Design a protein around this ligand. Structure first.
Ligand SMILES: OC[C@H]1O[C@@H](O)[C@H](O)[C@@H](O)[C@H]1O
Length: 441
């Protein structure tokens, strides 16, 4: 069959946000109740749900009769995009042994004691737990990667999927890749609450928050192929993304980091001069087992709309023509390539910032595109001259200018169009904005 048909046909619950309202679009009409303090924020493909730590911040799903008892004995899969802020080193020391649910089908203020399932967080652990009638429990404890730049519970949108085969195991997938599992034989009936609660439950950190989107339940244990297509079905390729996975926007500051050399920052030699790579400083914590390259150092860039022509959108679409500026000291300096400007061997054109030589054409029309690496939150940039001929993709070239030190210098080159299939490529960029979910320790 199709992966599309069985994904759709096994869907039993599907939360979608339309017209700023949250409802189940599965076909089963489970009623959804949004409390006053459940917030809506930018998501993966539309808006997403945002929960803070108070009793008014919650979204409840009252299961339709027809799907009431679907996970009592049968196989099921839960899927959703998740965004959790990077945990501070102090919060790992304070609340690191504090386990709190964020999504659950279990009861608590009656006397039941939670037969059912739950998605919970505990420091830098993602935990799936299933509990049956007898109080027997099975758990998957996923321990996140220690390098926070590449971790899954460190402020980027990530796609979670947990399948449960009652005859074998429960499997936890992150961005389509199997990352944890537990044998679930020995469990009896799951006799859970009639409501599925999205809420922070028993979290001691008053400032904790999480974002969730596309919460979906399937009536089967999905296989790896189905999971992969499902994951990729949300990655709409028209709207560019920032480093966190949210929509890239015009008129906002972004730090640039080259995807192929993620430990480097971008730096300016000078006004009217060139840009080059530098090593980012990093944070390490042996005791808590966490480390990362620090963010927010090095140049800030702004993307401006190159023309209006009708509808003005605040999001940048692939193919949009733009003007790129370096945002320095409250001033903004255009990035471009002067007519016969310095280049490496008549072909890697050296980019210049705020160049203004009298009488010399300065080419600065760029096109923001998504030409490769779909799952990665990165962007490519193409420069044009005034005959609308391609001057190349923005990348870096190793070399020296005058008597300066050898450096990886920012350039525009048509040479990258011959290598778009490579696994790793020098013309891919991450656009990083400052965010409350990531503060350096
Ligand atoms: O804002 C909407 C966008 O429309 C595109 O046509 C244009 O190339 C962009 O620069 C921007 O204006």
């Amino acid at each position: 069959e199709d992966i599309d048909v069985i994904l759709k046909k096994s869907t039993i619950l599907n939360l979608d946000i339309n017209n700023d309202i949250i409802s189940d679009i599965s076909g089963f009409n489970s009623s959804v109740i949004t409390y006053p303090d459940a917030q809506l924020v930018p998501g993966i493909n539309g808006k997403a749900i945002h929960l803070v730590n108070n009793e008014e911040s919650e979204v409840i799903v009252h299961k339709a009769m027809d799907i009431e008892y679907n996970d009592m004995f049968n196989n099921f899969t839960v899927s959703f995009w998740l965004r959790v802020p990077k945990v501070s080193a102090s919060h790992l020391e304070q609340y690191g042994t504090n386990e709190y649910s964020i999504i659950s089908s279990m009861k608590k203020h009656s006397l039941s004691i939670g037969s059912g399932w739950s998605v919970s967080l505990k420091g830098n652990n993602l935990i799936w737990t299933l509990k049956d009638s007898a109080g027997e429990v099975r758990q998957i404890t996923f321990r996140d990667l220690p390098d926070k730049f590449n971790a899954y519970l460190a402020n980027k949108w990530v796609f979670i999927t947990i399948t449960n085969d009652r005859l074998s195991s429960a499997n936890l997938y992150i961005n389509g890749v199997l990352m944890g599992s537990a044998e679930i034989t020995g469990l009896g009936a799951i006799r859970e609450d009639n409501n599925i609660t999205l809420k922070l439950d028993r979290c001691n950190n008053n400032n904790q928050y999480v974002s969730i989107d596309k919460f979906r339940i399937f009536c089967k244990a999905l296989n790896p192929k189905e999971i992969e297509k499902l994951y990729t079905s949300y990655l709409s390729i028209t709207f560019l993304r920032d480093f966190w996975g949210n929509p890239l926007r015009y008129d906002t500051e972004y730090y640039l980091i080259p995807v192929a050399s993620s430990s480097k920052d971008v730096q300016l030699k000078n006004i009217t001069d060139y840009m080059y790579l530098t090593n980012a400083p990093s944070y390490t914590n042996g005791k808590l087992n966490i480390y990362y390259r620090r963010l927010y150092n090095g140049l800030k860039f702004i993307i401006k709309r190159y023309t209006p022509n009708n509808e003005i959108d605040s999001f940048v679409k692939s193919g949009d023509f733009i003007k790129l500026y370096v945002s320095y000291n409250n001033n903004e300096h255009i990035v471009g390539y002067p007519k016969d400007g310095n280049a490496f061997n008549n072909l890697d054109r050296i980019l210049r910032v705020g160049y203004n030589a009298p009488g010399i054409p300065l080419y600065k029309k760029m096109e923001a595109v998504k030409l490769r690496d779909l799952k990665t939150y990165s962007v490519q940039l193409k420069l044009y001259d005034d005959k609308n001929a391609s001057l190349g993709l923005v990348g870096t070239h190793n070399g020296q200018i005058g008597n300066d030190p050898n450096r990886d210098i920012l350039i525009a080159s048509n040479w990258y169009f011959n290598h778009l299939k490579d696994k790793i490529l020098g013309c891919d960029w991450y656009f990083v904005p400052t965010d409350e979910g990531w503060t350096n320790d």
